[PDB]
Amino acid sequence: APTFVSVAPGQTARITCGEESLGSRSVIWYQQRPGQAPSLIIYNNNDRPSGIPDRFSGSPGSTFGTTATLTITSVEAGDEADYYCHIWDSRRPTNWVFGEGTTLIVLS
Amino acid sequence: QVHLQESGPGLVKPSETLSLTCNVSGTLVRDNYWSWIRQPLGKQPEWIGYVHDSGDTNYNPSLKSRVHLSLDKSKNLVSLRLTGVTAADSAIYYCATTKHGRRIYGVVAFKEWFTYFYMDVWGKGTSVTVS
Amino acid sequence: KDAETTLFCASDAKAYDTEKRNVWATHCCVPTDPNPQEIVLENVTENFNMWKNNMVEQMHTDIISLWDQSLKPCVKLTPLCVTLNCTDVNATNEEIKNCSFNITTELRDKKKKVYALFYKLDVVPIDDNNSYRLINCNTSAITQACPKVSFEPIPIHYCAPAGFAILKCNDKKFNGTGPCKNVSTVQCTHGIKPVVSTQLLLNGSLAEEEIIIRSENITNNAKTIIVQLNESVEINCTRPNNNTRKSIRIGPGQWFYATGDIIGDIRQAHCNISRTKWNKTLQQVAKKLREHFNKTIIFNPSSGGDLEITTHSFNCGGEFFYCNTSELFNTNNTITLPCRIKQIINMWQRVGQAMYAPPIEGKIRCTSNITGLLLTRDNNT
Amino acid sequence: EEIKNCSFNITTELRDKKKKVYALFYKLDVVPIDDNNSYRLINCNTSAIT
Amino acid sequence: EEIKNCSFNITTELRDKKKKVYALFYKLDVVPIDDNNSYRLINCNTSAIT
Ligand SMILES: *[C@@H]1O[C@H](CO)[C@@H](O[C@@H]2O[C@H](CO)[C@@H](O[C@@H]3O[C@H](CO[C@H]4O[C@H](CO[C@H]5O[C@H](CO)[C@@H](O)[C@H](O)[C@@H]5O)[C@@H](O)[C@H](O[C@H]5O[C@H](CO)[C@@H](O)[C@H](O)[C@@H]5O)[C@@H]4O)[C@@H](O)[C@H](O[C@H]4O[C@H](CO)[C@@H](O)[C@H](O)[C@@H]4O[C@H]4O[C@H](CO)[C@@H](O)[C@H](O)[C@@H]4O[C@H]4O[C@H](CO)[C@@H](O)[C@H](O)[C@@H]4O)[C@@H]3O)[C@H](O)[C@H]2NC(C)=O)[C@H](O)[C@H]1NC(C)=O
Ligand SMILES: *[C@@H]1O[C@H](CO)[C@@H](O[C@@H]2O[C@H](CO)[C@@H](O[C@@H]3O[C@H](CO[C@H]4O[C@H](CO)[C@@H](O)[C@H](O[C@H]5O[C@H](CO[C@H]6O[C@H](CO)[C@@H](O)[C@H](O)[C@@H]6O)[C@@H](O)[C@H](O)[C@@H]5O)[C@@H]4O)[C@@H](O)[C@H](O[C@H]4O[C@H](CO)[C@@H](O)[C@H](O)[C@@H]4O[C@H]4O[C@H](CO)[C@@H](O)[C@H](O)[C@@H]4O)[C@@H]3O)[C@H](O)[C@H]2NC(C)=O)[C@H](O)[C@H]1NC(C)=O
Ligand SMILES: *[C@@H]1O[C@H](CO)[C@@H](O[C@@H]2O[C@H](CO)[C@@H](O[C@@H]3O[C@H](CO[C@H]4O[C@H](CO[C@H]5O[C@H](CO)[C@@H](O)[C@H](O)[C@@H]5O)[C@@H](O)[C@H](O)[C@@H]4O)[C@@H](O)[C@H](O[C@H]4O[C@H](CO)[C@@H](O)[C@H](O)[C@@H]4O[C@H]4O[C@H](CO)[C@@H](O)[C@H](O)[C@@H]4O)[C@@H]3O)[C@H](O)[C@H]2NC(C)=O)[C@H](O)[C@H]1NC(C)=O
Ligand SMILES: *[C@@H]1O[C@H](CO)[C@@H](O[C@@H]2O[C@H](CO)[C@@H](O[C@@H]3O[C@H](CO)[C@@H](O)[C@H](O)[C@@H]3O)[C@H](O)[C@H]2NC(C)=O)[C@H](O)[C@H]1NC(C)=O
Ligand SMILES: *[C@@H]1O[C@H](CO)[C@@H](O[C@@H]2O[C@H](CO)[C@@H](O)[C@H](O)[C@H]2NC(C)=O)[C@H](O)[C@H]1NC(C)=O
Ligand SMILES: *[C@@H]1O[C@H](CO)[C@@H](O[C@@H]2O[C@H](CO)[C@@H](O)[C@H](O)[C@H]2NC(C)=O)[C@H](O)[C@H]1NC(C)=O
Ligand SMILES: *[C@@H]1O[C@H](CO)[C@@H](O[C@@H]2O[C@H](CO)[C@@H](O)[C@H](O)[C@H]2NC(C)=O)[C@H](O)[C@H]1NC(C)=O
Ligand SMILES: *[C@@H]1O[C@H](CO)[C@@H](O[C@@H]2O[C@H](CO)[C@@H](O)[C@H](O)[C@H]2NC(C)=O)[C@H](O)[C@H]1NC(C)=O
Ligand SMILES: *[C@@H]1O[C@H](CO)[C@@H](O[C@@H]2O[C@H](CO)[C@@H](O)[C@H](O)[C@H]2NC(C)=O)[C@H](O)[C@H]1NC(C)=O
Ligand SMILES: *[C@@H]1O[C@H](CO)[C@@H](O[C@@H]2O[C@H](CO)[C@@H](O)[C@H](O)[C@H]2NC(C)=O)[C@H](O)[C@H]1NC(C)=O
Ligand SMILES: *[C@@H]1O[C@H](CO)[C@@H](O[C@@H]2O[C@H](CO)[C@@H](O)[C@H](O)[C@H]2NC(C)=O)[C@H](O)[C@H]1NC(C)=O
Ligand SMILES: *[C@@H]1O[C@H](CO)[C@@H](O[C@@H]2O[C@H](CO)[C@@H](O)[C@H](O)[C@H]2NC(C)=O)[C@H](O)[C@H]1NC(C)=O
Ligand SMILES: *[C@@H]1O[C@H](CO)[C@@H](O[C@@H]2O[C@H](CO)[C@@H](O)[C@H](O)[C@H]2NC(C)=O)[C@H](O)[C@H]1NC(C)=O
Ligand SMILES: *[C@@H]1O[C@H](CO)[C@@H](O[C@@H]2O[C@H](CO)[C@@H](O)[C@H](O)[C@H]2NC(C)=O)[C@H](O)[C@H]1NC(C)=O
Ligand SMILES: *[C@@H]1O[C@H](CO)[C@@H](O)[C@H](O)[C@H]1NC(C)=O
Ligand SMILES: *[C@@H]1O[C@H](CO)[C@@H](O)[C@H](O)[C@H]1NC(C)=O
């Protein structure tokens, strides 16, 4: 299921997930460190729950024909994780399954 | 803080009913939506379904016919029950708190909006296999 | 002496190019006088009658004729009366159907399978299965509106031929029929915009001092009551989804314009009327109507009929809207009327002569003025 | 005698279908194609009929 | 060289039948459809011919 990103510490990583959007979307992104339950990074495209740093910022849900993207700037060794998106698109049925993720490998 | 502690049998046999629980501590079971997440080993997780008071409960259509969720208001537990257990049900199961919001794209009066959900507090989960 | 003659089309501006080809800029319509004169006739009395006025019949005839001529050379869509294989569009978890056709190509031996989107109002089921027909095939052939011709209203002046004159009534309170004391002579009328609508009159001229109610016979329930407002109410209308246009060849230089995929969200068309302006306006109309009846006056939604009569039909941007006014004829919010859109049209009750309105790409935004109402009547009320 | 009962295949409002229908014709309006029961209207050979 | 011998399927006076007929055309009036012996008249792409 997962794909890969190789990022040196301090570099920006671009993680994509899902197919091209049709309508307005609310994308939710989750981060899973090996051996851990996944946790929330962003919801509603750009809203970070408290405790998440601003190096984690998603693409907008305002346009069409694009794919969800999570940009992680200044990647740290502690950001090695499997990232998954859950896409809520206004023209598709509820997606009950998270999309295939990306393993972000920090080259530390 | 909020801690969600899952519990269950670990190993069940095919065609048996699987029954998992979740000890909720720091919140009351009727305070939020609850949801269950399933992660087959090596796969991206599935949302099994969500349960709440006021009847706002729904299930993943692929599981719906075999699944039941409930809130135990006396013991402050969240329960998950799966009947007809098979090979496909071998996964890590998690209990999580569910919060929601609304996305509006058009006229509210014409229902041009949708509800979206996200999982905030996650428990550690349990490993459930079959044989 | 009173007379009935042929008047001619005249316009104010020649600012219209030949790309737009507006039907009211025919290049067969003359410019009018940029500095028109008006002569006040002192010590005269003239009897005016708006209900027996022949200028109205002539304007009506000119408009029907103009539309038929403008559409005369354009593509006929009789090749589209084929079984349509239709399913709903992916506006899923309404009114737009995705339909497949078998269409003959430039080479007569071959047909191509093509798709188009249609509004539900234009498509009638044949079977209980996914098999549909266009609504016109049952009655008439469709002429596609010319894709290069604008039907946007341009003010037209109706002017007298040599030997004739037009008298104008300048009594501010002149209503239906009877004498006018302040009378003047003009070469011609003010510009009148040929705006087409059915429940609310749009973009006309407002009354000078008060609401004026005009009827042929105010005691006859079968007559239309025309209410001219002394204050306008704005309507904001839109077609919020982003359409695309798909060009389909249906013959040797014969192109059909189909609605292509919808981009972005699928949303319902609508019109916005301020609640406060509507409330005072409708109450003032009831108050003025009362002077002729001495009963309490209330309003109700229309009783039924096809969409042209039951809804606020109007054209905007070239698109044809049918808005639901039950929320008007019944706080500080805005009244949002849902609207529907349809492409297969039979204008002026001329059943037998259908037109297809091709899609317009992008989004549509309209601004218009309600300047009057067309009302009918069915107690101490 | 002189009245013939004829069957036609006529395209209906929907172009994909034809319906089998009947009409009576006078002999003077109908010309045989074959020696079998196969006929044509007399004008198809020369002109369209309004 | 430049003269092609072409076969057509043409609807006859009776609408139920087509006849196979031949005509010669100049190369300048005929455009290939395929790499095989399949051609079209040059106008069908743009206009009706009177
Ligand atoms: C006829 O009349 C009718 C009735 O009047 C008209 O109907 C209106 O039609 C319009 C059509 O555009 C609708 O507009 C949309 O409205 C929604 C909703 O916005 C409201 O709610 C937002 C959220 O509420 C917050 O507060 C409440 C409080 O209780 C809380 O409960 C809730 O949880 C939340 O905390 C407010 O933020 C928003 O305020 C903002 O906008 C105001 C507009 O005037 C402005 O005044 C404020 O100062 C403030 O700026 C408002 O209260 C909008 O969300 C929607 O806009 C989004 O969606 C469109 C379509 O996809 C998109 O193009 C926009 O760009 C935008 O998407 C951005 O924001 C999303 C928010 O979730 C985000 O998820 C997207 O990813 C994207 O994010 C971008 O911006 C953010 C900003 O932080 C940035 O961080 C991101 O990185 C990125 O850059 C439209 O505005 C009207 O709602 C509707 N009204 C009603 C009552 O129906 C009709 O139009 C009239 N017709 C005619 C012809 O006139
Ligand atoms: C198309 O896809 C979209 C999404 O992509 C689907 O959208 C949504 O889908 C939901 C179902 O998954 C629909 O949920 C139904 O809700 C009904 C109750 O009303 C809810 O929706 C309205 C809409 O405005 C809300 O206003 C309302 O409540 C609001 O306020 C609540 C208050 O919360 C406060 O307090 C709590 C504590 O209690 C705090 O935690 C909060 O923070 C807050 O302080 C708030 O909690 C709410 O979130 C919200 O803000 C509700 O949300 C229910 O009555 C329906 O239940 C039954 O009928 C439906 C009919 O289809 C069944 O599908 C459903 O399974 C239920 O069936 C019954 O039988 C089964 C058998 O197994 C049982 O399991 C069930 O328990 C039950 O007995 C739904 O729950 C939601 O409305 C919908 N959205 C829209 C806009 O429609 C969409 O449904 C789908 N389309 C179709 C056609 O399916
Ligand atoms: C009651 O009266 C009101 C008031 O008159 C009527 O409301 C009017 O209705 C008009 C027709 O629907 C509408 O005109 C269209 O407006 C669109 C939006 O324009 C915006 O941008 C312009 C910019 O103006 C500048 O550029 C123009 C270009 O010509 C110049 O002419 C100006 O002088 C300026 O230099 C603003 O001025 C507006 O306010 C808006 O902000 C236009 O896009 C649209 O033009 C396109 O469609 C035309 C159709 O005839 C076509 O001729 C023109 O060439 C454009 O088409 C091009 O682009 C499309 C895109 O898909 C493409 O397909 C074509 O092939 C082509 O490339 C019109 O100009 C009035 O704006 C509107 N007025 C108000 C206040 O809303 C009301 O309808 C009437 N009531 C009833 C019932 O009829
Ligand atoms: C709908 O009705 C409103 C009035 O209720 C119209 O608004 C009025 O439009 C006229 C133009 O015909 C404006 O007059 C002139 O405006 C120019 C603007 O620069 C100004 O320079 C002139 O001196 C003169 O004022 C008039 O002011 C304006 N009134 C208001 C209150 O804005 C509107 O045009 C009508 N039509 C539509 C489609 O809205
Ligand atoms: C009678 O009608 C004439 C118009 O035919 C009115 O004259 C106009 O009055 C306004 C007042 O400002 C002037 O601006 C116009 O230029 C005048 N027009 C002409 C043609 O003279 C006249 O005022 C009206 N009289 C009454 C009593 O209503
Ligand atoms: C077009 O008509 C066909 C049948 O009339 C519709 O159903 C398809 O039929 C074919 C026949 O082999 C199947 O292979 C397809 O799988 C059928 N489709 C589905 C979804 O089951 C077809 O859906 C119709 N198309 C439209 C646009 O209505
Ligand atoms: C005309 O439409 C018909 C159906 O409305 C098309 O027939 C189908 O063609 C597909 C091609 O694979 C077959 O699989 C289906 O089984 C056919 N349907 C039936 C009911 O037989 C027909 O091909 C279309 N004509 C053209 C030229 O596309
Ligand atoms: C073909 O046209 C006839 C009328 O010319 C249609 O008959 C009526 O159509 C209206 C339209 O909504 C229906 O409400 C009536 O109920 C119809 N009459 C009857 C007896 O049902 C006819 O329905 C049209 N063809 C199709 C397939 O609808
Ligand atoms: C404007 O309204 C008045 C009524 O307020 C009309 O008055 C006429 O009054 C006589 C009195 O017997 C009636 O017989 C007429 O039928 C009334 N006319 C109409 C049209 O109903 C007056 O004629 C109206 N019109 C004008 C231009 O003055
Ligand atoms: C219809 O649309 C017009 C503009 O297209 C609205 O006018 C605006 O109203 C706001 C109200 O605060 C003003 O701030 C803007 O400056 C106005 N715009 C212009 C160009 O003057 C009008 O209010 C809308 N009407 C309804 C019923 O929504
Ligand atoms: C068109 O006419 C032909 C005959 O002229 C019809 O063909 C006959 O159809 C019946 C239907 O059961 C068969 O039993 C006959 O054997 C057919 N005749 C031949 C020679 O094959 C044809 O069906 C008509 N078309 C339509 C749409 O009715
Ligand atoms: C088609 O038209 C031609 C004339 O244009 C017909 O030729 C003659 O028709 C008359 C009519 O009765 C006969 O008496 C002649 O004997 C016909 N000529 C010959 C040489 O037989 C022709 O017969 C028409 N087609 C058919 C099938 O009759
Ligand atoms: C229409 O043209 C086609 C070919 O372009 C003709 O089909 C051929 O007919 C002959 C008759 O024996 C067959 O031997 C060939 O095998 C057919 N070709 C193919 C590709 O099947 C067709 O008969 C013509 N129609 C008429 C009425 O003549
Ligand atoms: C159909 O018409 C188009 C033009 O409308 C033709 O396109 C060009 O035709 C010229 C004629 O020789 C060629 O030289 C060009 O190379 C053609 N364009 C391209 C991109 O190849 C088109 O070829 C015509 N169809 C056919 C089969 O000729
Ligand atoms: C006509 O409009 C003016 C605008 O100021 C208003 O004062 C007047 O009262 C209106 N007429 C009536 C009958 O209300
Ligand atoms: C609109 O008319 C209906 C008629 O049934 C009525 O029930 C409704 O309350 C009315 N709405 C308003 C705002 O008066």
Numbering used by the authors:
A (entry chain L): 6 to 9, 11 to 67, 67A, 67B, 67C, 68 to 95, 95A, 95B, ...
B (entry chain H): 1 to 82, 82A, 82B, 82C, 83 to 100, 100A, 100B, 100C, ...
C (entry chain A): 46 to 138, 152 to 189, 191 to 309, 312 to 321, 321A, 322 to 354, 356 to 359, 361 to 392, ...
D (entry chain C), E (entry chain E): 152 to 189, 191 to 202
Recite the paper's sentences.
The HIV-1 envelope glycoprotein (Env) trimer is metastable and shifts between different conformational states, complicating its use as a vaccine antigen. ConM is based upon the sequence of all group M isolates and stabilized by an SOS disulphide bond, whereas ConS is a SOSIP—UFO combined design of a group M consensus soluble trimer. To interrogate the effect of EDC cross-linking we carried out cryo-EM analysis of trimers bound to PGT12232 Fab fragments, and solved the structures of unmodified and cross-linked GMP versions of ConS at 3.1 Å and 3.45 Å resolution respectively, and unmodified and cross-linked GMP ConM at 3.4 Å and 3.85 Å respectively.
ConM and ConS trimers are both based on consensus sequences of group M isolates, and have ~91% sequence identity and Cα RMSD between protomers of ~1 Å. Inspection of the unmodified ConM and ConS cryo-EM structures identified a number of notable features shared by these two Env designs; among these are the trimer stabilizing mutations A316W and H66R. W316 is found at the trimer apex within the V3 loop. R66 is found within a loop in the gp120 inner domain, just beneath the apex. Interestingly, in both ConM and ConS maps, we observe density for two rotamers of the R66 side chain, with one conformation exposed to solvent and the other forming electrostatic interactions with T71 and S115. The equilibrium between these two states may underly the mechanism by which H66R inhibits CD4-induced structural changes. Two-dimensional classification of trimer morphology by negative stain electron microscopy (EM) revealed that unmodified ConM and ConS trimers were 99% and 78% well-folded respectively prior to modification, and 94% and 99% well-folded subsequent to cross-linking and antibody selection. Unmodified ConM trimer was highly susceptible to elastase cleavage, losing >80% integrity within 1 h, and was almost completely hydrolyzed by 24 h, whereas cathepsin G had only modest effects at 1 h, but band density was reduced by ~85% at 24 h. However, comparison of the unmodified and cross-linked structures revealed a striking near identity, with a Cα RMSD of only 0.45 Å between ConS and ConS-EDC, and 0.5 Å between ConM and ConM-EDC.
